[PDB]
Design an enzyme around this catalytic site. Structure first.
Site, PDB file in Angstrom:
ATOM      1  N   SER A 120      27.984  57.310  24.895  1.00  0.00           N
ATOM      2  CA  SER A 120      27.582  56.135  25.678  1.00  0.00           C
ATOM      3  C   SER A 120      27.408  56.539  27.142  1.00  0.00           C
ATOM      4  O   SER A 120      27.985  57.532  27.596  1.00  0.00           O
ATOM      5  CB  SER A 120      28.624  55.022  25.568  1.00  0.00           C
ATOM      6  OG  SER A 120      29.848  55.374  26.197  1.00  0.00           O
ATOM      7  N   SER A 140      23.078  52.092  30.009  1.00  0.00           N
ATOM      8  CA  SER A 140      22.495  51.184  29.026  1.00  0.00           C
ATOM      9  C   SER A 140      22.122  51.981  27.750  1.00  0.00           C
ATOM     10  O   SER A 140      21.420  51.466  26.865  1.00  0.00           O
ATOM     11  CB  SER A 140      21.273  50.502  29.629  1.00  0.00           C
ATOM     12  OG  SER A 140      20.358  51.498  30.056  1.00  0.00           O
ATOM     13  N   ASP A 161      19.738  69.491  38.621  1.00  0.00           N
ATOM     14  CA  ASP A 161      21.040  68.914  38.302  1.00  0.00           C
ATOM     15  C   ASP A 161      21.702  69.549  37.088  1.00  0.00           C
ATOM     16  O   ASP A 161      22.419  68.876  36.355  1.00  0.00           O
ATOM     17  CB  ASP A 161      20.910  67.403  38.094  1.00  0.00           C
ATOM     18  CG  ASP A 161      22.181  66.651  38.440  1.00  0.00           C
ATOM     19  OD1 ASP A 161      22.938  67.122  39.312  1.00  0.00           O
ATOM     20  OD2 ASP A 161      22.420  65.580  37.844  1.00  0.00           O
TER      21      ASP A 161
END
Ligand SMILES: COc1cc(-c2cnn(C)c2)ccc1Nc1ncc2ccnc(-c3cnn(C)c3)c2n1
Length: 261
Positions: free
Chosen positions: A18, A21, A132
């Site tokens: 998770s 959203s 990143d």
């Protein structure tokens, strides 16, 4: 519970992760084949968030053919309310794997490194700089690392954002972000797999941490190891001047990844 993607039905075995959203689910097709399906709820998404997702899907789709080091995307369904992505299911993400490992085998380390270099190199070819990179961006699929994302759309946690992999050029200009910025971050992942910690993990204050990454006077420690090539790789990766830092194409011709034992 089940779900449908482009007419095909998939049974939910478990929810893998998770984040925001987003939810990732381990699922089975009618022939009892495993997949990972990423569900994105667009019901609260703005035009900035929508464009991030559209960009990441397009790149994952484009790169499929180019390399097998990019996580497979077999199908996807997109509407105004949601996004469904039918992807290959990996065993575990690299970050979770690194936390569980008491020691990393030298052979496993080199093989994973080659996978990371091939995956990142491929994105670079199309003009994409991740900027990143971190262990969580990689998935272990049958003893082979694969790149999950381009760090745009969203970050997920297994069912907190670290600065330990950030390149100096990013902090300095606060463009100088180039494919060399990814070399620093990959260098930090390899450093962690070699010394058990990131080059700057020790400094607690994030502002001091950021100041140490951009300071040539602050010297990164490289303790001696049996793999002299590995030590060289590390030092070539963690040069603060991107112009003096090694490149991925050059890394792929290095003794460490081309010569074993
Ligand atoms: C059994 O499957 C997993 C378990 C874990 C896991 C198990 N324990 N922990 C701590 C993590 C992580 C990834 C996976 N696999 C997996 N496969 C495809 C995926 C496709 C896209 N995204 C992910 C993903 C991203 N972050 N996470 C945690 C999973 C995927 N994760």
């Amino acid at each position: 519970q089940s779900m449908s993607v482009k007419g095909r039905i998939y049974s939910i075995l478990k929810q893998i992760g998770s984040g925001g959203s987003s939810k990732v689910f381990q699922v089975l097709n009618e022939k009892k084949q495993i997949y990972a399906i990423k569900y994105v709820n667009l019901e609260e998404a703005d035009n900035q968030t929508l464009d991030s997702y559209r960009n990441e899907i397009a790149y994952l789709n484009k790169l499929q053919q180019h390399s097998d080091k990019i996580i497979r995307l077999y199908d996807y369904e997109i509407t105004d309310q949601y996004i469904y992505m039918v992807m290959e299911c990996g065993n575990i993400d690299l970050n979770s794997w690194l936390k569980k490992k008491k020691s990393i085998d030298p052979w496993e380390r080199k093989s994973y490194w080659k996978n990371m270099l091939e995956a990142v190199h491929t994105i670079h070819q199309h003009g994409i700089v991740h900027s990143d990179l971190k262990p969580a961006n990689f998935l272990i699929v049958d003893g082979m690392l694969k790149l999950i994302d381009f760090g745009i759309a969203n970050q997920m946690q297994p069912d907190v954002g670290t600065v330990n992999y950030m390149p100096p050029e990013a902090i300095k200009d606060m463009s100088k972000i180039s494919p060399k910025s990814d070399v620093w971050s990959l260098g930090c992942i390899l450093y962690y797999m070699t010394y058990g910690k990131t080059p700057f993990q020790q400094i607690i204050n994030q502002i001091s941490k950021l100041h140490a990454i951009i300071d040539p006077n602050h010297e990164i420690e490289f303790p001696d190891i049996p793999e002299k090539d590995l030590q060289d790789v590390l030092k070539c990766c963690l040069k603060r001047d991107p112009k003096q830092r090694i490149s991925i194409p050059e890394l792929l011709a290095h003794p460490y990844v081309q010569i074993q034992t």
